[PDB]
A paper describes a structure:
Bromodomains (BRDs) are acetyl-lysine–dependent protein interaction modules that play a pivotal role in chromatin biology and control of gene expression. Acetyl-lysine recognition is mediated by a binding cleft formed by four canonical helices (αZ, αA, αB, and αC) and two connecting loop regions (ZA and BC loops). This interaction site is highly druggable, enabling the development of potent protein interaction inhibitors. To address this issue, we developed a promiscuous BRD inhibitor [bromosporine ([name])] that broadly targets BRDs (including BETs) with nanomolar affinity, creating a tool for the identification of cellular processes and diseases where BRDs have a regulatory function.
To ascertain the predicted promiscuous binding mode, we determined high-resolution crystal structures with different human BRDs. In all cases, [name] was resolved well in the high-resolution structures and inserted into the acetyl-lysine binding cavity of each BRD module. In all cases, [name] exhibited a common binding mode, whereby it engaged the conserved asparagine [N100 in BRD9, N140 in BRD4(1), and N1602 in [name](2)] while extending its sulfonamide substituent toward the front of the ZA-loop binding cavity. The excellent shape complementarity with diverse acetyl-lysine binding sites explained its high binding potency, which we further characterized in solution by isothermal titration calorimetry (ITC). For several target subfamilies, [name] represents the most potent inhibitor developed to date. [name] exhibited affinity toward previously untargeted BRDs, such as [name](2) (KD = 43 nM), and provided a novel chemical starting point for BRDs that had been previously targeted with only very weak compounds, such as P300/CBP-associated factor (PCAF) ([name] KD = 4.7 μM).
Residue numbers in the entry: 1512 to 1650
Amino acid sequence: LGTENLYFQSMQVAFSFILDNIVTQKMMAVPDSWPFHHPVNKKFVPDYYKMIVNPVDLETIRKNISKHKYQSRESFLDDVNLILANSVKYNGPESQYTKTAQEIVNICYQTITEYDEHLTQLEKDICTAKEAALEEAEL
Ligand SMILES: CCOC(=O)Nc1cc(-c2ccc(C)c(NS(C)(=O)=O)c2)nn2c(C)nnc12
């Protein structure tokens, strides 16, 4: 009956959905983030792709997510971290581009963090319950 696939596919779907929501609801809502919503346009930044080796932006990350490219937390956080890392490399730490990439990276970390609080707590509750029941038939 392919339970095992269905369970994994199902986990994929919920994950992508979560990632898609952090991107559009979080990272794209940072004020002054417009420039991070799309790939850096050569016509307005002709040096960009001479200095930047692995470029990324929030729209390309949405596309990846829509195609289930990110199968772990770390794979996703690798592309997110490039947002800040490419801004420091191209602009340095003093720039508004760097201040804004920082806000964007920040809220993705805060959001994934608070999520995991919630999971690891639900999980501990599940284990209490499981202990409790086993403790009751013994009595
Ligand atoms: C100060 C000297 O440094 C830089 O030029 N910095 C950067 C400049 C721009 C940038 C400019 C102009 C426009 C119109 C856009 N929008 S688009 C259509 O290219 O997506 C983006 N992005 N950017 C990003 C990301 N990271 N750094 C920069």
